[PDB]
């Protein structure tokens, strides 16, 4: 694969990406239009890596939404099949991300928070209606371009409402995603894994935008539970019983019963409607949390809310392919079939 005079793309420079790491900022040499090119090296060498490549390709090809990262192109194999070893994915060019924005000397007024939260929830309403749970939402995974467009990226951890018992995370839910943004159901293995997982992460991100500091920056497993309880208080007897691990259950039962700290105390002088919505997201019980679609209907987002401009995704996405136990070679065949289908649907 080359990027010379006769080739489709011109490599401008190597840049960073909060969701996908090292990418090449490039221009489609025919239009001059800027894009990001992600090389997935040795894509077929490791089962879990090849499975991730196929999962992301299928999820991104399923979605067509301005708040979700899109595939602009996929380079076809330029060598014989046996030699095809690295995949080149052409994506929307996104210069920054919410992590970089929050944690810099850039302005981040209440209006910036309101608009970024709106875009995130808009993308989530669509994703969630397709039966897709991101499971790893965090400010670095929320790409932001020069036109202030926010796009959800990195679907590596994404799953449906049904998962395979064959994969390790099915039991080891406390290792699903990132500690600082991990929903209590994942941390405690509460056997209730729905789109509600994402709304806890949204809450953590929303709080972080408001204070420009991480809300629950736990140093380890217990410290993470500790920090959550210092604000939310002691979990109810019902969730304590649903904790299927004696040591965790016993550490919770060991500290003094604590009352929830009003959000207005955690964030002094912050906007009322903002804390009203924030409180609806950060609840221990996944069934207690407001949904992405109900959140779009909240007064805090009334400035941007337009139901005719916040679509659902039809039909739902099917994770059956991912539940299959495929060899590295059968995954390679499925990825090559995805690339061919991408181009077949274009012409
Ligand atoms: C180091 C980073 C986090 N890795 C990463 O971006 N990977 N790793 C794999 N296996 N696949 C990807 N990215 C990817 C795969 C498919 C599409 Cl359509 C877009 C992006």
Residue numbers in the entry: 47 to 393
Manuscript excerpt for this entry:
Compounds 2 and 3, like compound 1, bind at the conventional ATP-binding site, while compounds 4, 5 and 6 bind at a novel allosteric binding site. The allosteric binding site is located in a cleft between the P-loop and the αC helix adjacent to the ATP-binding site. An intramolecular hydrogen bond between the amide O atom and the aniline N atom forms a pseudo-bicyclic ring system that maintains the compound in a planar conformation. The primary amine donates hydrogen bonds to the side chains of both Asn95 and Thr99 from the αC helix. π–π stacking is observed between the triazole ring and the guanidinium group of Arg98. Glu102, meanwhile, adopts an alternative rotamer allowing the formation of a salt bridge with Arg98 and a hydrogen bond to Tyr66. This new network of hydrogen bonds contributes to stabilization of the allosteric pocket. Differential flexibility in the P-loop amongst kinases has been implicated in the selectivity of certain conventional ATP-binding site-targeted kinase inhibitors, and may have implications for the selectivity of our allosteric ERK5 inhibitors (see §3.5).
The ERK5 protein, which is encoded by the MAPK7 gene, comprises an N-terminal kinase domain and a large C-terminal domain containing transcriptional transactivating functionality and nuclear localization and export sequences (NLS/NES). ERK5 is the effector kinase of a canonical kinase module comprising MEK (MAPK/ERK kinase) 5, MEKK (MEK kinase) 2/3 and ERK5 itself.
